[PDB]
Each structure stands twice: as structure tokens, then as C-alpha cells.
């Protein structure tokens, strides 16, 4: 099973530096090309760099040349992107991918991606508030309840319900940037009205940039 | 550099329809074009490579073709799980470049939203800010007007909406509208109401509460 | 600029798809017609009816 896993993404100030890693498994990077590709509101999908670890040859996008360097350690089966002199327009999801694997001339495996946010604003953990079920959140014998995850920076936060046991009927809304420059989102789920008071409902909130982990019990 | 011009940017079809997405290279790229799918919260996933070849494990309803500098992705029988953004990419010359994408959505029958309202929690109120949440659940189509009224006065500039992407199971949308006030302002008033207008409702629906009522 | 040309694609069997083309008015127009022409191969000769000063199109295919 071929897998690529990116890490190292995070909040960084303009002009600052960051180093991303791309850990490969289920194949050897010595047998393929490895690319970095990023994705942003401004430019959509934009190729960043590539390397052929077998011989060390590299190529870069004009927009990052001199500021970013790609490298690979075949002994750890891992590729890296050093990112210096960072700017607002470098904010993006950064993916690593392979090309030419098993002789397929396309990017056939991509990692989950790692978020780089270039900003002068400070990290802030969210407050998590109950969205309690009530007579105003129920109809047809179903009830809605949730958690409001308010005032954090930067993205992302993750929300799960009952440790991932509860997935049916869950809507976690896309984050919205408030005027304060902080993000907020709600996650809601709809459940049988009759289960309220007998079945426990907990939203598990994680905001890794601030090391915030909250498990909030939501009650009638 | 070579650019890839993708059209249309948005396409909506019914389940089982044949849909066509196109990509035009700004100069000859031979057959060096791949197509990727990107689902909500996902990474790009290879569908077709070298213009016309199906990647392993990709459903046979996906096919690609080339005519000169024109590339076409066809989905022969659109399925609910096919809703995603689709991108072409050329690898003929460096830099490899991608198209701007095409968003594919499903058409289904009209469904009115379930409307719910949540007053600020007691926890939140302790901190000087009040968030009131209006929830529109599992509706179609996406268009919907949500207005806030506080003691019957229409609110403006103090609410924000978030809308899920289309659900890959039931093809519906959900939407939250959040009204933000200071604790003091929230305590100045009694009646909080969210009013929803949607094609599936015979007339607009108001969902409300009186601050303090259990 | 940046307008959205909204298009109804009306196939001979009565099935209907909808599309948007974005760009300058001129670019978006060109792409809508180009797309129409492409669909016409599989779906028969097209006719395009312009509505709202060119910003909306109903495009029917003969079969």
C-alpha cells in the first residue's frame, strides 16, 4: 500500500521560515519523481517543485525559486521542502505527490496535505459552547444539537462526535472568518428525540495549533 | 508556460446523466494530460492519465479523450458520489500546470429545510458575547434567504452564514446563520427570530424564542 | 468584468443540465458556444437563444 504523509505545516510570520516533510511508504522514492504541489484561493492548484531522488535533479516554479528548496533522503524514504522568506501568497495547502510510480505518467498518489498559513496574527485556541437540544431544535421526532467552536486562529479545527462513533446526521460547517480576524464554526447532529437523556452526546474538538483538546458534553 | 483552460466552471446534472467537462491546452501537449477528482475535504485523486487511460480502481463510467489541444472528461452515468471538483493537468513541459477546475453538482427534487434555533449557552453568556444560531437542515436547492429579527427589528451587518457542500448521499445542503451580539445587547431584548425563505416552503417560516424562557 | 453566463442545456430527450461560464463577457460567450458545439457532436445540432442581453443562454440539442 502506497502512502505519502505531509507534516510541518503551520502558522508562520511573513519573512519567516518553515520546513515540510513528506514521508513515503509502500514504495521507494528512489524509483519515482516526487513533487510538491500547493492549492490556494488565489492560484488554485499550483505546482511548486520536483526532485528525482535517484540523481538529485530538481526543478522549481518561478514564483518560489531562491526561497524554497526541495530535497530527499532516500535512507528515510522522505522528501522535504524548506520554505524561506515566506509571503502571504504562499498560504496554501501543500501536498506531496509521486510521479512515474509503477510507470504511470501522472501524479497517482497524493498525501493528505499540510496547511501553511503566513500571517502576523497570533495563535488562539477556541472556546467551545454547547448547542443544546430543546423544544426549539426538534421536529418530526428528531432533535438537533451541536457545539459552537468560537474564536480561533489559525485553521484548522477538527470536530468529531462520541469519539467517531457518531457520524450519521453530522454536519460540521465550513469555518467562517469573523470581523475580529478569528475563525468560528458550528458542528451539529440530528438524533432521535427519544434518545435525549439516555444517550450521551459529546463533541470532540481539536485545535492542534494551540494544543487545545476539548470534549464537550451536550445536554438538554 | 502552457496554460489549461477548463470549461464550464460549474455543471449541474441529474443522477444518471452523461456529463462532459473540457480542457484546452494553450499549445500542443500531445497526450500528456491527466484528470483528477477532489471531494470535500479531500486530496486530488487520479482518474485518467495520458488523456484517455483509466487509472486502476476508477469506475468505468469515467472516460477521457483528446482532439488536438482539446481534452474531454466524460462521466457516462452521473452518480451522487461523483459530486466533486474536477481538474485537468498537463505534464508536457515544465512547469506542469492545472486547469481552474469544474465543480459538478447533482440535481434532485426540491426539499424544504428543517429550521431550528439555538439561544446562546449559559456558558457563553458569562464571557460578554452572545451567539444565536439558526440552522437550516437538509434542503434543496441551495438558494435560501435567512433574516434575523430582534424584537421585530430587522438585523443587518451582524450575522454570518456557512453552507455545507452538497451531501454525497442525499444530495442536500445544510446552512447555519449566526447572529452575534454583546451580552449587554442580548440582555436588552426579548424576542429573537430567524426567518427563512426557501422554494420548498409555501411561505416563509419564522423560528423564534424569548430570552429567558426554558 | 468577470460575469457569469448561466446556461440551460436542453437535450432532445427532455433532460436538462445547467452550467456556468465565467470570464469577461466576450470570453465566457466564446466558451459557451465552443462547449455547445462540442456537445452537438454527440447530442445533435444545437440552437442557442440568448436572454438577458447575452448573459443567459438556453441551448437546445436536436438529437
Amino acid at each position: 500500500e502506497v502512502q505519502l504523509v505531509e507534516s510541518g505545516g503551520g502558522l508562520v510570520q511573513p519573512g519567516g521560515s518553515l520546513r515540510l516533510s513528506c514521508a513515503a511508504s509502500g514504495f521507494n522514492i528512489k524509483d519515482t519523481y516526487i513533487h510538491w504541489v500547493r492549492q490556494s484561493p488565489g492560484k488554485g492548484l499550483e505546482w511548486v517543485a520536483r526532485i528525482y531522488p535517484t540523481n538529485g535533479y530538481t526543478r522549481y516554479a518561478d514564483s518560489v525559486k531562491g526561497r524554497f528548496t526541495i530535497s530527499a533522503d532516500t535512507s528515510k524514504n522522505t522528501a522535504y521542502l524548506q520554505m524561506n522568506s515566506l509571503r502571504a501568497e504562499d498560504t496554501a495547502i501543500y501536498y506531496c505527490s509521486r510521479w512515474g510510480g509503477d510507470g504511470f505518467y501522472a501524479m497517482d498518489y497524493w498525501g493528505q496535505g499540510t496547511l501553511v498559513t503566513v500571517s502576523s496574527a497570533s495563535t488562539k485556541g477556541p472556546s467551545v459552547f454547547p448547542l443544546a437540544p430543546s423544544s426549539k431544535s426538534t421536529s418530526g421526532g428528531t432533535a438537533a444539537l451541536g457545539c459552537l467552536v468560537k474564536d480561533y486562529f489559525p485553521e484548522p479545527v477538527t470536530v468529531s462526535w462520541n469519539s467517531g462513533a457518531l457520524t450519521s446526521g453530522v454536519h460540521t460547517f465550513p469555518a467562517v472568518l469573523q470581523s475580529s480576524g478569528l475563525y468560528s464554526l458550528s458542528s451539529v447532529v440530528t438524533v432521535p428525540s427519544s434518545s435525549l437523556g439516555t444517550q450521551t452526546y459529546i463533541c470532540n474538538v481539536n485545535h492542534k495549533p494551540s494544543n487545545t483538546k476539548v470534549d464537550k458534553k451536550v445536554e438538554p | 508556460d502552457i496554460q489549461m483552460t477548463q470549461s464550464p466552471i460549474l455543471l449541474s446534472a441529474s443522477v444518471g446523466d452523461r456529463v462532459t467537462i473540457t480542457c484546452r491546452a494553450s499549445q500542443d501537449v500531445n497526450t500528456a494530460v491527466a484528470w483528477y477528482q477532489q471531494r470535500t475535504n479531500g486530496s486530488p485523486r487520479l482518474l485518467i492519465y495520458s488523456a484517455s487511460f483509466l487509472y486502476s480502481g476508477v469506475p468505468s463510467r469515467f472516460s477521457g479523450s483528446r482532439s488536438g489541444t482539446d481534452f474531454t472528461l466524460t462521466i457516462s452515468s452521473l452518480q451522487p458520489e461523483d459530486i466533486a471538483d474536477y481538474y485537468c493537468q498537463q505534464h508536457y513541459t515544465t512547469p506542469p500546470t492545472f486547469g481552474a477546475g469544474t465543480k459538478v453538482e447533482i440535481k434532485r427534487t426540491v426539499a424544504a429545510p428543517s429550521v431550528f434555533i439555538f439561544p446562546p449557552s449559559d456558558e457563553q453568556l458569562k464571557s460578554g458575547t452572545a451567539s444565536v444560531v439558526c440552522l437550516l437542515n437538509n434542503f434543496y436547492p441551495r438558494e435560501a434567504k435567512v433574516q434575523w429579527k430582534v424584537d421585530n427589528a430587522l438585523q443587518s451587518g451582524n450575522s454570518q452564514e456557512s453552507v455545507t457542500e452538497q451531501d454525497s448521499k442525499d444530495s442536500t445542503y445544510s446552512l447555519s446563520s449566526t447572529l452575534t451580539l454583546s451580552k449587554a445587547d442580548y440582555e436588552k431584548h426579548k424576542v429573537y427570530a430567524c426567518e427563512v425563505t426557501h422554494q420548498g416552503l409555501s411561505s416563509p417560516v419564522t423560528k423564534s424564542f424569548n430570552r429567558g424562557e426554558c | 468584468s468577470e460575469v457569469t453566463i448561466k446556461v440551460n442545456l436542453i437535450f432532445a430527450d427532455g433532460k436538462i443540465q445547467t452550467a456556468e461560464f465565467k470570464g469577461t463577457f466576450e470570453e465566457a460567450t466564446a466558451e459557451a458556444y465552443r462547449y455547445a458545439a462540442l456537445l452537438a457532436k454527440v447530442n445533435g445540432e444545437y440552437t442557442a437563444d440568448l436572454e438577458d442581453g447575452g448573459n443567459h443562454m438556453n441551448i437546445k440539442f436536436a438529437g
Binding site: P41, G44, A92 | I9, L10, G42, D85, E165 | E20
Partner: peptide, 12 residues
């Protein structure tokens, strides 16, 4: 339509 970082989807 523009790519959105939170959803990883084009927003129209």
C-alpha cells in the same frame, strides 16, 4: 468560483 481552504472545494 474560487478554491476554499476550509472545505478544499471550489466556492461559487
Amino acid at each position: 468560483c474560487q478554491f476554499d481552504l476550509s472545505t478544499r472545494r471550489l466556492k461559487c
